[PDB]
Design a protein around this ligand. Structure first.
Ligand SMILES: CCCCCCCCCCCCCCCCCC(=O)OC[C@H](COP(=O)([O-])OCC(O)COP(=O)([O-])OC[C@@H](COC(=O)CCCCCCCCCCCCCCCCC)OC(=O)CCCCCCCCCCCCCCCCC)OC(=O)CCCCCCCCCCCCCCCCC
Ligand SMILES: CCCCCCCCCCCCCCCCCC(=O)OC[C@H](COP(=O)([O-])OCC(O)COP(=O)([O-])OC[C@@H](COC(=O)CCCCCCCCCCCCCCCCC)OC(=O)CCCCCCCCCCCCCCCCC)OC(=O)CCCCCCCCCCCCCCCCC
Ligand SMILES: CCCCCCCCCCCCCCCCCC(=O)OC[C@H](COP(=O)([O-])OCC(O)COP(=O)([O-])OC[C@@H](COC(=O)CCCCCCCCCCCCCCCCC)OC(=O)CCCCCCCCCCCCCCCCC)OC(=O)CCCCCCCCCCCCCCCCC
Ligand SMILES: CCCCCCCCCCCCCCCCCC(=O)OC[C@H](COP(=O)([O-])OCC(O)COP(=O)([O-])OC[C@@H](COC(=O)CCCCCCCCCCCCCCCCC)OC(=O)CCCCCCCCCCCCCCCCC)OC(=O)CCCCCCCCCCCCCCCCC
Ligand code: HEA
Ligand code: HEA
Ligand SMILES: CCCCCCCC/C=C\CCCCCCCC(=O)OC[C@H](COP(=O)(O)OCCN)OC(=O)CCCCCCCCCCCCCCC
Ligand SMILES: CCCCCCCC/C=C\CCCCCCCC(=O)OC[C@H](COP(=O)(O)OCCN)OC(=O)CCCCCCCCCCCCCCC
Lengths: 552, 54, 203, 79, 145, 139, 92
């Protein structure tokens, strides 16, 4: 009547069980794990660049960073953390859980998704390789505006390596988007109608549509810039519409880029909230409609980053910016309603989800203030924008990514992350982030724009910069608990031998063994709603799931 | 790791397209044994003989 | 080993039973083509913004577009599209040989289009216009040469798929590969129709 | 402003906060059950642990059958 | 028949899809993870030399401890080449049971040695260390087949 | 497959509306008429969604309701031999390395390296494409 | 189907009884499969020593010495981790 199980599972595994798989792996789960690990490594690199910039910025003088060294620092930091940590980790979470969430054995084109991972990794390596060059990495900021990016201005090889590395990463991202759209469209469980799949897969599908809408424009613009640099191809000659041509093209890419960076983690948080609230995601149809509206409007409000150029139809883009701000509000209120009136238990995944809510709210207040061109004029290209987009980003792709990791780590590892370490990590991260980036609103409101290596002692914003440095180093130390937790909980750590380590789960990735079987499934439940696993594990609740649904 | 790839090919056999099992939603790789097959589906495992495996 | 563990006639079959469910290869290639359309959208945006900024004579004095060598190449690309469609018509059946013949002639006409474009490029550069030379020259060369790289990639796909048909029994999977390659070639010729209309007709 | 002072601040406030939070959290009882004291009665359900050490020939459960436990000895002890 | 008290449902095939509340764990073994890992090492590669599946049964084995030990050994995947050490700390009773395959490999002599090691450790006041010591001693006693 | 097509139909409708309104409001009320950068991008993203949605709608009309599109569908309804799913393959990493070689050759203007990377890309794509078709060696 | 199982009889000659086991290296008896851990640790320590002494040289910069120190430190940390884990029995 009793089963012969081991005292403790395998910690590490037999020698040489991973290297050849990593080289050859076609499974989506392992590829997603590699995405997560590599993206977190790039996050550490970009954060190290951030701490370098911050240590320099704590002092009015140039303590240890030359002007161009600091410029390369913020350039490569922004590029690493947007195009080489976030846009890859969205697809890392995709490969990780989306095939499970639709009841699929694998992704549509598994060799294509492995190719996407490898194309990303090597594109990131070549982009970073700008540093080893004597000139260094790219001086021009993440945006890489035109006349500063031509051969004449910034003639360095770091710029060319950056261009081609971003191109390779973009090809990888495009392949990933094609793969994920094909997977969601074609591969899907026998009962999993499009309107009953989890919010995360909806977000990933719309995110991939945006990826295809945007990243090809990045590839075209980067190839045009490379032609301009290596052939003098007059593509972006300022005497043409070159500077505004590049502005329009690059922003038509990047703004949908920030929304592909956001939406997948909106989906992650939408998966987190119902399970720890013990109630369905509030307004599921509302969430999907809000995601569709978000993507639609994001594709067409790109040029609110160009308010100060004096060369855009300001009223049109301001109106569209407000119109896209509204759906994010709908989604936020759906999240709040999901939390509303449930037996809330604040484990580390939902601690990170609520931290996302808190930080992203202030980020969005800053965004709505920025949306007005009259206000943007003063606060444009300043540390107010730094604070805005750091709040929104760090909320949506760091807090949300931490929530996703703490959530699906058991379902991808068979082991639970230490909860006390999760508490410590979350609180360190929250305190450090709010300390480092809150003061930057006032820092940029008073004259101190972005991309300044140093500032005069006679100028203000010195105590506030050292406050920001205290915050940045708080974040730096905060990273250590999470790394230790993952390292000591992958191979050691509380084994989870059942589905739903986070009880009251849903979205169908908890209908399969906690270390998911190769092909993700030995059994599929009766898919009849948005929560197949919740219905399976709690059959008695099914009637209730349909009884109170309409009451609201 | 190459040795383990060979050993798993011997234990299970070559790999092919995926099939969804009839009653339930199980997905199975639809392997192909290289040697004698046991009374049930799974084959007797073959012993490595120092030669490349398909 | 007796007969087979998986009762399949080929080591690789169609990724979906296309009779009742969508064919993932076709869906994926269509999605990727829609993305490459946005790539060419970036190229077209470059060309058009350059056009808006010329002093009323968009083709500079040194440059004079040659319709004599431009109309034949677009016609040949349209013909290659038609022959690719008949190659598809052969592919849906078991006739690997008809597919191979049609795709071979399509490859020959695409190669002729590439050579004609190269000859027109040689004529254009010899008569002044050049990528470092001028904005019109650079935008025109960038757009048409990226389309030419796409055409060369399509030729690579044609030759690779013909080799693949040589090396294995023609199966619905290879038929699907031929259909998706035809989709790509049709996209290539469509973007060429647009590029020729804008560069040469609309100007 | 007072390079030494603010450098010490940026170096210590993170560390001080980390130590405070580690004391707050890492010093909390974990969810793992406390070790079973010998004097206390055995309250946990029966436990059987096995090595999974030796190869099982075939993997598939079918064709393993139940030949016999075929006991080959015994021993006992009273602590 | 009845699934777990809550949240566990029988799926289409035989496998059961169970759940736990977010806070608590699943294994629930009343031992530090470090000592469980050490005992796993003793059973897994502290036994490979024995080539005899080594099993530990901490549960209670009442009545005639010998017969229940045989019945528990029946639960081991390969009871024929298997050495099972079953200890009940409620009864302070150890038992060791083997199969026909492990015969003449030094198992019989290592039987009292393993039992004595386990008993000494238990009286010193540590169940798990006794389990690990007995596993090590018996494994070193049993030469590979 | 009605929902899949309808999604892209809605996206096409919005993108066409956005392109038309941007073109109309930028041809007039702008300092240099139509931007020709945002307008073209909007037009051809409308075209992107149009291609995808038209293909999806054609498929949906051509395809009978799958279980994946059918509510009240039992799991056993979808049972059957799913198509080929490429197992373990090392050709993707080789393709990535070859494209990285070509990319560095492009960045560092090394025409020889660009040519070598292009050759490597062709070879590795050949390997990937032919991996599951290379008939047995006939000696 | 188009293949035949191979029967390989190779002369074997240490007896492989001690060292590595087929569970860790599935082809242990088919060839050299075990490098003693002692030689690996000594080689790592000697590599660290070489990197450190290589700071001795005719170079004026110190970025180079710092990189050497970092690499020697990480090598020594890896060697120490492996040695400590093996001493304690691959724990923690
Ligand atoms: C030039 C440099 C060359 C690079 C090589 C350096 C060293 C050689 C490594 C060998 C390559 C390899 O992949 O083998 C792994 C190799 C072990 O060999 P194996 O065949 O994997 O052994 C099988 C295991 O016994 C059993 O393995 P398993 O399948 O159970 O997996 C267990 C493992 C791994 O768990 C996994 O499943 C890992 C899957 C994702 C990881 C791989 C992502 C990267 C893929 C791209 C490259 C792969 C090729 O989980 C862990 O506990 C790992 C440590 C905890 C990580 C979390 C920390 C937070 O790992 C090592 O011992 C070396 C450590 C890795 C070095 C990478 C880090 C170096 C620099 C760090 C800086 C990062 C930030 C800035 C950049
Ligand atoms: C400059 C622009 C040049 C653009 C040229 C690209 C033309 C591609 C359209 C042809 C249609 C097609 O790919 O159908 C796949 C078709 C069917 O594959 P399958 O094995 O039946 O599908 C099974 C699944 O893949 C099951 O396993 P799976 O995951 O492999 O799925 C198959 C399929 C997945 O199917 C697809 O997704 C097909 C299209 C989606 C992505 C296509 C990206 C290809 C190029 C992207 C680079 C951006 C530009 O993936 C492939 O095997 C395609 C190889 C793509 C390599 C990517 C290179 C980086 O494969 C073929 O027989 C044709 C492939 C031939 C490609 C040659 C292109 C070489 C480009 C270099 C030429 C140099 C010129 C300029 C310098
Ligand atoms: C330096 C020189 C180094 C040595 C060069 C040797 C060149 C040829 C050696 C032997 C020729 C041979 O086997 O032909 C008889 C060969 C029969 O032998 P086999 O035993 O059937 O071939 C072994 C495989 O089973 C055949 O595999 P399969 O037929 O099942 O299909 C796989 C495909 C594999 O080839 C591929 O990779 C197919 C994809 C083509 C990639 C091209 C993309 C790049 C751009 C093209 C389009 C963009 C514009 O192999 C072939 O293409 C076989 C035809 C032979 C040409 C080899 C490739 C060229 O093929 C024929 O039936 C007649 C074709 C003869 C024409 C080949 C002429 C190429 C070389 C010209 C002069 C030599 C180089 C001087 C410089
Ligand atoms: C001229 C000739 C000069 C040659 C010099 C003499 C040496 C020659 C041969 C020695 C090389 C060798 O095989 O050493 C193995 C040997 C370990 O013995 P073993 O029996 O092979 O390993 C048993 C355990 O599995 C031990 O490994 P483990 O799996 O238990 O733990 C490794 C790893 C577990 O990680 C994994 O295995 C999974 C892979 C990590 C996940 C992916 C990483 C992130 C990637 C994302 C980045 C993308 C951006 O955990 C960690 O990450 C360590 C945590 C804290 C590290 C503290 C020290 C720093 O290492 C040593 O004791 C010698 C170290 C000497 C340093 C060599 C210099 C470069 C390092 C290459 C070797 C890699 C070390 C292996 C770990
Ligand atoms: C994940 C990344 C992410 C996300 C989600 C967003 C979301 C938003 N962004 Fe963000 N943005 C960036 C990343 C992001 N942004 C980056 C990286 C830059 C860099 C610029 C550069 O360096 O060049 C940038 C720049 C940027 C600017 C340019 C500032 C400047 O450079 O001068 C502006 C507006 O001008 C803007 C606006 C918005 C708006 C309005 C939203 C909204 O979509 C979301 C927030 C708005 C809300 C409204 C949510 C809260 C809603 C409610 C609480 C409902 C009730 C409230 C109301 C109805 C008001 N962003
Ligand atoms: C995902 C995106 C993202 C994230 C997470 C961050 C995170 C941070 N950023 Fe941000 N940042 C951007 C995206 C991001 N940033 C962008 C897009 C810009 C504009 C770029 C431009 O204008 O060109 C920008 C700009 C920017 C500037 C402006 C520089 C200037 O213009 O002069 C500053 C200044 O302090 C800054 C600081 C920080 C800090 C302190 C953090 C912290 O949250 C970071 C936390 C760091 C860690 C957790 C690292 C600790 C780790 C270790 C110590 C281990 C290291 C080990 C190895 C490397 C192996 N950022
Ligand atoms: C990315 C590539 C690099 C960056 C992006 C470039 C994109 C360009 C695409 C197509 C254009 C090719 C058409 C070529 C023919 C056009 C004619 C012309 O341009 O004029 C002759 C001039 C001399 O002009 P001149 O000195 O003034 O002397 C006047 C004499 N009286 O040659 C030239 O510079 C033109 C040579 C251009 C060769 C480009 C090779 C592309 C292959 C790249 C492979 C993929 C790389 C992958 C990267 C991830
Ligand atoms: C995490 C660490 C992060 C540390 C980050 C700190 C980076 C700061 C470095 C440079 C800033 C720009 C200044 C540029 C100028 C250089 C500084 C200087 O001026 O210091 C004097 C000598 C030249 O003096 P000299 O004319 O030649 O003659 C003299 C007469 N006897 O340079 C030096 O000491 C060089 C010292 C520079 C610090 C070391 C940087 C390399 C660290 C590598 C760590 C990698 C670890 C690898 C792990 C495997």
């Amino acid at each position: 009547e009793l089963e012969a199980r081991r005292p403790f599972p395998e910690r590490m595994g037999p020698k040489g069980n991973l290297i050849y798989k990593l080289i050859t792996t076609t499974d989506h789960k392992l590829i997603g794990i590699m995405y997560c690990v590599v993206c977190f490594a790039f996050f550490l690199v970009g954060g190290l660049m951030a701490l370098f910039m911050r240590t320099e910025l704590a002092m009015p003088g140039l303590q240890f960073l030359s002007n161009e060294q600091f410029n390369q620092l913020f350039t490569m930091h922004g590029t690493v953390m947007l195009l080489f940590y976030a846009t890859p980790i969205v697809f890392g979470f995709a490969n990780l859980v989306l095939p499970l969430q639709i009841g699929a054995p694998d992704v549509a084109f598994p060799r294509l998704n492995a190719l996407s991972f490898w194309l990303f990794l090597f594109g990131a390596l070549i982009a970073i390789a700008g540093f080893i060059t004597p000139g260094g990495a790219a001086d021009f900021g993440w945006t890489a505006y035109s006349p500063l990016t031509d051969a004449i201005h910034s003639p360095g090889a770091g710029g060319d390596l950056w261009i081609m590395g971003l191109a390779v990463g973009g090809l990888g991202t495009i392949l990933g988007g094609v793969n994920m759209i094909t997977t969601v469209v074609c591969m899907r469980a026998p009962g999993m109608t499009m309107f009953r799949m989890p919010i995360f897969t909806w977000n990933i599908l719309v995110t991939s549509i945006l990826v295809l809408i945007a990243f090809p424009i990045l590839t075209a613009a980067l190839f045009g810039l490379a032609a301009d640099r290596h052939l003098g191809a007059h593509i972006y000659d300022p005497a043409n519409g070159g500077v505004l041509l590049w502005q329009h093209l690059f922003w038509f890419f990047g703004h949908p880029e920030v929304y592909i960076i956001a939406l997948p983690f909106f989906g992650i948080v939408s998966e987190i909230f119902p399970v720890f609230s013990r109630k369905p995601i509030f307004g599921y149809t509302t969430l999907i409609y809000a995601t569709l509206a978000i993507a639609a409007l994001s594709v067409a409000v790109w040029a609110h980053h160009m308010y100060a150029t004096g060369a855009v139809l300001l009223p049109f883009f301001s109106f569209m910016t407000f119109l896209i701000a509204v759906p994010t509000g709908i989604k936020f209120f759906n999240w709040i309603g999901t939390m509303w009136k449930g037996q809330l238990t604040f484990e580390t995944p939902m601690l990170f989800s609520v931290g996302f809510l808190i930080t992203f709210l202030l980020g969005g207040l800053s965004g709505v203030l920025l949306a007005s061109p009259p206000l943007d004029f003063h606060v444009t290209d300043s540390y107010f924008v730094i604070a805005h987009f750091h709040y929104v980003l760090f909320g949506t792709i760091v807090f949300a990514t931490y929530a996703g990791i703490y959530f699906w780590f058991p379902k991808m590892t068979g082991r639970l992350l230490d909860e006390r370490l999760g508490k410590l990590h979350f609180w360190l991260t929250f305190i450090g982030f709010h300390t480092t980036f809150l003061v930057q609103h006032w820092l940029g409101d008073e004259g101190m724009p972005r991309r300044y290596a140093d500032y005069l002692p006679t100028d203000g914003f010195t105590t506030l910069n050292v406050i920001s440095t205290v915050g940045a180093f708080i974040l730096g130390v905060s990273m250590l608990p999470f790394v230790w937790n993952v390292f000591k909980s992958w191979r050691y750590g509380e084994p989870v031998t059942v589905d739903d380590p986070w009880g009251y789960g849903n979205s169908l990735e908890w209908a399969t063994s906690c270390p998911p079987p190769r092909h993700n499934f030995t059994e599929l439940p009766r898919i009849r709603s948005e929560r197949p696993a919740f219905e399976l594990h709690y059959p008695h609740m099914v009637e209730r799931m349909r009884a109170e649904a309409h009451v609201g | 790791s190459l040795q383990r790839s060979d050993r798993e090919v011997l234990e299970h056999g070559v790999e092919t397209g995926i099939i969804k099992r009839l009653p339930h939603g199980a997905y199975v790789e639809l392997h192909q044994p290289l040697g004698p097959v046991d009374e049930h589906g799974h084959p007797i495992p073959l012993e490595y003989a120092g030669a490349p495996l398909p | 080993m007796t007969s087979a563990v998986g009762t399949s006639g080929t080591a690789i079959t169609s990724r979906v039973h296309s009779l009742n469910r969508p064919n993932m290869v076709s869906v994926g290639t269509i999605v990727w083509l829609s993305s490459e359309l946005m790539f060419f959208a970036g190229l077209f945006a470059m060309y058009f913004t350059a056009r808006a900024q010329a002093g009323g004579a968009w083709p500079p004095e040194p440059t004079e577009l040659n319709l004599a060598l431009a109309v034949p190449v677009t016609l040949v690309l349209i013909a290659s599209s038609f022959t690719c469609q008949m190659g598809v018509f052969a592919a849906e059946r078991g006739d690997v040989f008809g597919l191979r013949r049609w795709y071979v002639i399509t490859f020959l006409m695409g190669l002729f289009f590439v050579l004609g474009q190269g000859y027109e490029y040689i004529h254009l550069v010899e008569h002044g216009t050049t990528i470092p030379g001028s904005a019109y020259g650079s935008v025109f060369y960038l757009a048409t040469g990226f389309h030419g790289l796409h055409v060369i990639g399509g030729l690579v796909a044609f030759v690779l798929l013909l080799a693949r048909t040589k090396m294995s029994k023609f199966t619905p999977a290879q038929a699907t590969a031929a259909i998706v390659v035809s989709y790509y070639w049709h996209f290539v010729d469509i973007v060429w129709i647009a590029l020729f209309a804008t560069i040469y007709f609309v100007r | 402003m007072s390079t030494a002072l603010t450098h010490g601040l940026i170096g210590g406030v993170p560390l001080v906060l980390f130590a405070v939070l580690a004391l707050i959290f890492l010093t909390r009882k974990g969810p793992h059950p406390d070790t079973y004291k010998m004097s206390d009665p055995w309250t946990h359900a029966p436990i059987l642990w096995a090595a999974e050490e030796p190869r099982e020939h075939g993997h598939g459960g079918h064709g393993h059958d139940s030949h016999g436990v075929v006991i080959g000895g015994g021993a006992s002890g009273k602590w | 028949e009845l699934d777990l008290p809550y949240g566990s449902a029988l799926t289409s095939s035989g496998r059961i899809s169970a759940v736990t509340e977010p806070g608590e764990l699943s294994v629930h073994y009343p031992f530090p993870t470090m000592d469980l890992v050490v005992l796993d090492d003793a059973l897994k590669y502290g036994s490979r030399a024995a080539k005899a599946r080594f099993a530990v049964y901490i549960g209670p084995l009442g009545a005639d401890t010998a017969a229940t030990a045989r019945e528990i050994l029946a639960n081991v995947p390969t009871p024929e080449n298997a050495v099972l050490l079953a200890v009940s700390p409620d009864q302070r009773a150890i038992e060791v049971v083997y199969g026909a395959d492990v015969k003449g490999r030094g198992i019989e002599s290592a039987a009292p040695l393993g039992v004595s090691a386990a008993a000494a450790s238990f009286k010193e006041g540590n169940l798990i260390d006794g389990l690990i010591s007995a596993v090590r001693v018996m494994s070193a006693g049993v030469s590979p087949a | 497959m009605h929902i899949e097509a309808r999604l892209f139909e809605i996206l096409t409708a919005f993108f066409a509306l956005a392109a038309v309104v941007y073109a109309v409001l930028t041809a007039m009320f702008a300092t240099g008429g139509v931007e020709w950068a945002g307008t073209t991008a909007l037009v051809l993203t409308t075209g992107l969604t149009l291609i995808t949605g038209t293909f999806f709608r054609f498929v949906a009309r051509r395809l009978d309701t799958r279980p994946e599109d059918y509510e009240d569908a039992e799991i056993s309804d979808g049972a059957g031999e799913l198509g080929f799913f490429a197992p373990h393959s090392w050709w993707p990493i080789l393709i990535s390395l070859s494209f990285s070689t070509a990319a560095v050759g492009a960045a560092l203007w090394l025409p020889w390296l660009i040519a070598a990377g292009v050759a490597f890309v062709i070879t590795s794509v050949c390997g990937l494409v032919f991996e599951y078709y290379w008939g047995p060696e006939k000696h | 189907m188009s293949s035949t199982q191979d029967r390989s009889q190779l002369d074997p000659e240490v007896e492989r009884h001690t060292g590595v086991d087929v569970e860790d290296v599935p082809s242990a008896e088919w060839g050299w499969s075990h490098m003693p851990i002692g030689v690996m640790h000594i080689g790592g320590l000697l590599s660290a020593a070489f990197l450190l002494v290589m700071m001795r040289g005719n170079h004026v910069g110190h970025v180079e010495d710092w990189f050497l120190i970092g690499f020697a430190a990480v090598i020594v940390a890896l060697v120490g981790r492996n040695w400590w884990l093996r001493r304690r029995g691959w724990i923690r």
